[model samples]
Target: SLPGSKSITARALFLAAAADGVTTLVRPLRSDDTEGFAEGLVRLGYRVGRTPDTWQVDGRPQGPAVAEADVYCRDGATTARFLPTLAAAGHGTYRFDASPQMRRRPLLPLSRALRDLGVDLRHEEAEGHHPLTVRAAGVEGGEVTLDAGQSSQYLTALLLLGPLTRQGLRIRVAPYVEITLAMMRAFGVEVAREGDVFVVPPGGYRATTYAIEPDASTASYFFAAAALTPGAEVTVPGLGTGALQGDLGFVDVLRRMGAEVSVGADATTVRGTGELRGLTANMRDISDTMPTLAAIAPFASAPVRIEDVANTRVKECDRLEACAENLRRLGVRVATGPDWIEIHPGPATGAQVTSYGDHRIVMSFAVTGLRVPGISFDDPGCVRKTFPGFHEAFAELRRG
Candidate 1:
């Protein structure tokens, strides 16, 4: 099948680098983003080796281990956000930059939080953006509050550094922080919760063999493809009812749209009922699939209204606006507010959909192309950020 979970791959790499011994990741994703993260870890003086089936990361409990370096995050937001915190746990001066597209993404929340924890960090050009520098004297660790509404990566960055802090870390809860906590626990770090606050103890991560589940976010595209094609069925092996990735919740949204969803022990399948009904949904926690759902909206019988995903505006692109603009190009009537998008069904037109250099936009609109001809992409190759062979996999799905 595909590699492994991109989300899990990034997190596991970070935790393994922070842990005290050798860590092995089985079936971890090997994509542009994950490779960038592993290379970044290497620059920080951690040993990461890869075979075809496994990644062996030699943990560094002494923190980042690098004294000076420049880290390139490329278009991976997970790498952009997670690596800086990992750097702060070490003593060094590290500068971070990214692809031109990633330069516009918000990094202030995480940067400011690091500063609050006693790291000397400064934004080089923009106040709230990247191309910044971090002067790390090791994370002192303490209580810090942040607005994680824009990106859960902000909270995740802080939580990952919690165990490395001398005083531990106390963070005010934010949306999707639970996912970070779950991954942390899986790596042998316990995060105690008190009301809306999370208490992270200061023992640091323990290296162990971590088996990553299949990426639910990537699987969502296949599920969406099935829902858009009548009587189509798509099954993603190794993702079931107990999957940890929240993007699997996209299946529930598809179910609400009249698709039959089956979550079994070994796999999750979605079968189209040959009909789809529009519905309103608040996708705050499951916001990654907003574009996926928006892509299929025009195929539904009524308008699909997606709400509570304002955070999407700060992703690889202003996904809310990207979806609306691309849908408009496809002859689907779309109206968008700051946090909501309403898509009305219409006869899709043959047009070139702009990817905005965003992987989600490219993948989501590609799903639309399965039903509407002549829907080409402005930058079709941008799927390399996560699924390097996404178009090939998608084409196979259509042919099958």
Candidate 2:
């Protein structure tokens, strides 16, 4: 089994905080990123109780419990992006900042949309970036055009804040927003989609006990391991056809490469067939797992082309270039574009993987090490962003 999802846990935290009464989140992920978000909630004066397995939050449906606060978002993009929007639903001056790396990431589209909704938000330094202040006077939500091409988290941030708005929010061109509403509905909020616009009603989210599923993106590594090692099988519970996470689709990519895949109602398994085929794969919807596929692409029978994931460039690092450069260091032929990468299968000689402080880069390349000897990482500890115990867990799996 894998750990809880970072994405789901972040969303759960935002929803739980915006709800009325107390919400219990069962099995939420605990990582540097997630802990940063929880700490940000506490900074906002929301009462959050954390145990090893569950998190109990005292929701302030009307907004934050304080009139002013300073929130440092750490390196969590969800915290840097969504928390301010949640703060806007209340009456106060909430100043939000993040790590230097996160400040380089753009949330201008979200900033603009929040401004459109009559929220007083301003950046202290770079515009559209972090180190900003949101003077909360409550949002008078309405239809707003958002450029979600960069990241769906912007739209999701707004959707999560919709119920707290006086008039609700209707975003143009929005699931990933669906995932937000799905959890939002669990907490007593619903959104209706029309054409390309999502109409969200204003009322409020009800506090409820919610359970987070395992991280499918995290499962990608184990599945890739199973696919690379012939006869090796790996199964992860709490994820399947009924799972809401789109990242689960990474299995289809593995299956196309001749790996045996079993997707059950609540569990999924992958078995290596010792036959790996390469093909063109569009990962626009599930780009987080692109690094996993790219890291293992050099072992494929033919050239592997992954496209439509330009949004990955602005993650913790330039993921596309990071993958290409590290693969090149390992003696693999790699080519990349603005939104795609093509890796040609060839003899791989192990070298150091430059993590660029990105956890996915480190974890993905760990699978490449299964086939290539002498593989190492410049920053293996970077996995703490999502999975702190990755090395130990992966080392055990390698022994298996």
Candidate 3:
């Protein structure tokens, strides 16, 4: 589900493989995004093998990737972002390329940081964009400060490589350090805060078998689906009791939305039986749920206020604007700002919808469309990036 914490799982897997150990990834997602990441790792000389649910990554701890290769992230952002940093840690000149859609993602900030770390990085097409190249010069990490306001992945990309550097890395963020830090901690990398600066030591990451938790972002769709229909109870298995994913808090969001949410040791269930309530909050940590929130907002008594998600502008698409525009097409009153969006509740007029090639957008809107009837997706296959089984999963829950 959503590549089983695509950001954290991929970063952790890379760290484990780089450290050269028998790193086992339990229940690692097998999808385009993660498959691209696994392929990128293989191209860099790390041996990766899998058996249905378990992935065994053998790291070459002696040094960086041995072979000079052309690694592609396809349309996967985790591969696009994290691999550059890993390539920088190794001793191989890697040419990175991606699909047309992946080329649109911004990678300059991380590329600049890698450049500062003594790597020869150049943008193949435009400066500050993807479809780039990184000549593996081996990084000597010092103080690498990044502007976290734009994308947390940039900070995460660098932070995951900190331990592999000659000297441990010290990161100073432009505020908003929680999400990035949370991801690091999930993989057992602790970030110590001393007076305003964050420091991560050079000791290697602990290589342990980790089972990826059920995606909270994907789970939201099921929760929202249940909330939109009576006697609908959606249950997701494999999420840990105390998980590191920030999106897990989405259960509380659904609970507040007039749904009964129960959290078990390994699963979460959401059931809806009452009128949908108005939701107004700044879901900065769970920004991925904005589309679902926006789509379902129209059923509420008041407008759903979504705030603190400026980074959505730099995602696969302008999520805030795209969601609002789609909602308006469905006859919903949506007021959108720079970072925040508010959707006024109204009746669904059933309009044709587009996926915009964003997986979350498709999954979130699909949940809303399913509950409203007379709604169909133009390109439902766009979810292959993360949750490829979304349509099949939804089909099991579909009703006339």
Candidate 4:
């Protein structure tokens, strides 16, 4: 499975710890990123464990961390976001760092918000990048406005911490907020709108066990495989119709390319017709699909254009540039901009590709490499960041 969306899992992890309940999360992915995120939670004194497919989180609702330890969060963004927020609400200091690759990920907006919430967060290196010092400052519960145009994770960090704050923080999004309010309501958070402002009460989160849906972002890759491979039928178990992840929008992206897509109560399936048409769509809401779309572009008969998703530039890598370069390395024609990429489908002359340390880049290109003979990845292990079973699950696809 795609693991729960890092965005959803990270926020839910913090909410579970702060809310009074024994939260059970199903389909939680056990990758390096999720592991680092869980480790960050453990550093804050929450008991988190995993069976084969289920993850159980016994939360500490008192808002007081059981351990007085310094946390080291690796390169996972969820850890970077959720850990800092929890540390701000807890009793200990945290030393958060990531792999050199993750160090390059963005953290300034959330760091500033946490500081405004009375958390003492100091950047150890670059201003807008990671490797930070988070000491206990306690929640002040004040209104903090952030630029959500950058990343929704920034707003999610503040929203998840709102209930535990002394005064309860109200987040104001400038211009636009990409996440739907319905998803938050499904999670049982009462997010009400009061004259252009979103209100979250200070009483704290409701204690309830919630199961996260499979990752829509990860599902995009399989969908792309169905489009790229002549007779591919990809089924992602555990993702139902009522999924919390918004990235499910990518299914429509594949559907537009002539793939037979089915989304059900417990899973999403994609079957290829062996024929692909070109498409030009704005993927601002489903930006995670860019890598997969770009990876499959060369196999299509028409040009695929992605627009309005500049956010991918700040992810684990400049995905636009990285994807375009990798596509070109495989002998495809690609054009890129700050926020968009256009891929011209042609023959893929099998070539070795580099993932640039971005997990999505690695996984997306790996799937593409698998479809073309003589193509292989330099670091196949990078998928552990988000999908540890990617190689194994892909094996099943290969057998078919």
Task: Give the winner by lDDT.
Answer: 2
For 86-153, candidate 2 gives per-residue lDDT tens digits of 89899899989899998999789999988988889998998899899999999888989888786878
How well does each candidate superpose onto the true structure, as a TM-score?
0.72, 0.75, 0.75, 0.72
Model 3 TM-score, all chains together? 0.75
lDDT of 4 by residue, 123-187 (tens): 88888677777677568686787766667777767777776777766787621232434444544
Could you give candidate 3's per-residue lDDT for residues 123-196 as a string of tens digits?
A: 88898777777777666777866765667778777777777777778877632356456645644678787774
In candidate 2, where is summed lDDT lowest over 10 consecutive residues?
173-182
* Alpha-carbon lDDT of model 1: 0.85
Model 2, which residues run further than 4 Å from truth?
43-45, 67-77, 92-112, 120-137, 145-151, 172-178, 256-258, 273-362, 377-389
Cα lDDT for residue 176, candidate 3? 31
The 10-residue segment of model 3 with minimum total lDDT is 174-183
Location of the lowest summed lDDT over 10 successive residues in candidate 1 = 172-181
Query: Which stretches of model 4 miss by more than 4 angstroms?
Result: 31-50, 65-140, 144-154, 172-184, 192-198, 301-346, 354-362, 378-389
Cα deviation at 390, candidate 2, in Å, is 3.7
Model 3 steric clash pairs: 20-59, 64-90
Per-residue lDDT of model 1, residues 1-400, tens digit only: 7558866777777888888889888888777778889888888888889998888999987777768999998888788888888887888899999889999987888888888778888889888778988888887778898777766667777888899888899998543566678888878888998997889999888889877778788888999999877889998877887678888899999999989999997789899998799999999989989999999999898989999998999986899999999999888899989899999998998899888899999899888888898988889889987788888898899899
